[PDB]
């Protein structure tokens, strides 16, 4: 479900809050640690193997 | 650390003039009295638009 | 620090369909024992293949 759900790029396209150190209100309450850039998560996932 | 590449969005190269595979067209206007008639409209617009 | 650019490999951009300059071609069968002869095919293979 999470992989076949299509999200329109127009929501967060390059022209969003230009010059503004902001956070999208939708992502304010969404967990940021559940992200594929989580450094410790990357380290553990690679450490156990690929 | 071969994490792969973030390339979901396609990236495209484009013609320097916006578009190049145009074609010659002639403006026409609906005919009076014919539900589906038309005539050449050379009076106002150049008949060689692309 | 004009350290230079790492650009050893060529980088290429390709047509959207990947292939553009094609040529229409038609299928051909070998002749039945006619010294490496050939004969046009009509076995529901399109005579226009790109």
Coordinates of C-alpha atoms in Angstrom, one line a residue:
Chain A
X1 CA 0.0 0.0 0.0
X2 CA 2.7 2.5 1.0
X3 CA 4.7 1.7 -2.2
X4 CA 1.9 1.8 -4.8
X5 CA 0.2 5.0 -3.5
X6 CA 0.9 7.9 -5.9
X7 CA 1.4 11.4 -4.5
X8 CA 1.2 14.4 -6.9
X9 CA 4.5 16.2 -7.1
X10 CA 2.8 19.6 -7.1
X11 CA 2.4 19.5 -3.3
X12 CA 6.1 19.8 -2.5
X13 CA 7.5 21.0 -5.8
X14 CA 10.5 23.3 -5.9
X15 CA 8.3 26.5 -5.6
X16 CA 7.3 25.9 -2.0
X17 CA 8.0 28.6 0.7
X18 CA 11.0 30.0 -1.1
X19 CA 13.4 31.6 1.3
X20 CA 11.3 30.4 4.3
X21 CA 12.9 28.2 7.0
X22 CA 9.6 26.3 7.4
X23 CA 8.2 22.8 8.0
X24 CA 5.1 21.6 6.1
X25 CA 2.2 21.5 8.5
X26 CA 1.3 18.0 7.3
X27 CA 4.8 16.7 8.3
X28 CA 4.7 18.5 11.7
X29 CA 2.8 15.6 13.4
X30 CA 4.2 12.9 11.1
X31 CA 7.0 10.9 12.6
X32 CA 10.3 12.1 11.1
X33 CA 12.4 9.2 12.4
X34 CA 10.6 6.8 10.1
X35 CA 12.6 8.1 7.2
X36 CA 15.1 6.3 5.0
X37 CA 17.7 8.9 5.8
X38 CA 17.7 7.9 9.5
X39 CA 21.5 7.7 10.0
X40 CA 21.4 5.2 12.9
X41 CA 18.8 3.1 11.1
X42 CA 21.0 3.1 8.0
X43 CA 24.0 2.0 10.0
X44 CA 22.1 -0.8 11.6
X45 CA 20.4 -2.0 8.5
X46 CA 23.8 -2.1 6.6
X47 CA 25.6 -3.6 9.6
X48 CA 23.3 -6.6 9.7
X49 CA 23.9 -6.9 5.9
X50 CA 22.3 -5.9 2.7
Chain B
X1 CA 28.0 2.8 1.3
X2 CA 26.0 2.1 -1.9
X3 CA 22.7 3.5 -0.7
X4 CA 21.6 3.8 -4.3
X5 CA 20.3 6.9 -6.1
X6 CA 17.3 9.2 -5.5
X7 CA 15.9 9.3 -9.0
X8 CA 12.1 8.9 -8.7
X9 CA 11.4 12.0 -10.8
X10 CA 12.4 11.9 -14.5
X11 CA 14.7 14.6 -15.6
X12 CA 14.5 15.9 -19.2
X13 CA 16.4 17.8 -21.8
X14 CA 14.4 20.2 -23.9
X15 CA 14.8 22.1 -27.3
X16 CA 16.3 25.5 -27.0
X17 CA 13.2 27.1 -28.6
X18 CA 10.6 25.3 -26.4
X19 CA 9.6 23.2 -29.4
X20 CA 10.9 22.4 -32.8
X21 CA 8.7 19.7 -34.5
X22 CA 6.0 22.3 -35.5
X23 CA 4.1 22.3 -38.7
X24 CA 2.5 24.9 -41.0
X25 CA -1.2 25.7 -40.3
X26 CA -3.8 28.0 -41.8
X27 CA -6.4 29.8 -39.7
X28 CA -10.0 29.1 -40.7
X29 CA -13.4 30.4 -39.6
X30 CA -16.8 28.8 -39.6
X31 CA -19.0 29.3 -42.6
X32 CA -22.4 31.1 -42.4
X33 CA -25.4 28.9 -43.3
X34 CA -23.4 25.7 -43.2
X35 CA -23.4 23.9 -39.8
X36 CA -20.0 22.5 -40.6
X37 CA -18.5 24.8 -43.2
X38 CA -15.2 26.7 -43.1
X39 CA -13.2 29.1 -45.2
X40 CA -9.6 30.3 -45.3
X41 CA -8.9 33.3 -43.0
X42 CA -6.0 34.9 -44.8
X43 CA -7.4 38.4 -44.3
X44 CA -6.1 38.9 -40.8
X45 CA -3.6 36.2 -39.8
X46 CA -0.7 35.0 -41.9
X47 CA -1.7 31.7 -43.4
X48 CA 1.7 30.1 -42.5
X49 CA 1.5 29.8 -38.7
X50 CA 3.5 27.1 -37.0
Chain C
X1 CA 40.1 25.7 -4.6
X2 CA 39.8 25.0 -8.3
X3 CA 40.3 21.3 -7.5
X4 CA 38.9 20.2 -10.9
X5 CA 36.0 18.1 -11.9
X6 CA 35.5 14.3 -11.8
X7 CA 34.1 13.7 -15.3
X8 CA 35.8 10.7 -16.6
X9 CA 32.8 8.8 -17.8
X10 CA 30.6 10.2 -20.6
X11 CA 27.1 11.3 -19.5
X12 CA 24.3 10.8 -21.9
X13 CA 20.7 11.9 -22.3
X14 CA 18.4 9.7 -24.4
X15 CA 15.1 9.9 -26.2
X16 CA 12.0 9.3 -24.1
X17 CA 11.1 6.1 -26.0
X18 CA 14.7 5.2 -26.1
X19 CA 14.6 4.6 -29.9
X20 CA 13.7 7.2 -32.5
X21 CA 15.5 6.8 -35.8
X22 CA 14.0 3.5 -36.9
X23 CA 13.2 2.2 -40.4
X24 CA 10.2 0.3 -41.5
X25 CA 11.1 -3.2 -42.4
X26 CA 9.4 -6.4 -43.6
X27 CA 9.8 -10.1 -42.6
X28 CA 11.4 -12.6 -44.9
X29 CA 11.6 -16.3 -45.0
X30 CA 14.3 -18.4 -46.7
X31 CA 13.4 -20.0 -50.0
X32 CA 12.7 -23.7 -49.9
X33 CA 15.9 -25.1 -51.3
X34 CA 16.6 -22.4 -53.8
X35 CA 20.3 -21.7 -53.1
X36 CA 20.0 -19.3 -50.2
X37 CA 17.0 -17.6 -51.7
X38 CA 14.5 -15.5 -49.8
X39 CA 10.8 -14.8 -50.0
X40 CA 8.5 -12.3 -48.4
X41 CA 6.5 -13.4 -45.3
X42 CA 2.8 -13.2 -44.7
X43 CA 2.4 -15.1 -41.4
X44 CA 0.5 -12.3 -39.5
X45 CA 3.8 -10.5 -39.0
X46 CA 3.3 -6.8 -39.8
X47 CA 5.0 -5.7 -43.0
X48 CA 5.8 -2.5 -41.2
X49 CA 8.1 -3.2 -38.3
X50 CA 10.2 -0.4 -36.8

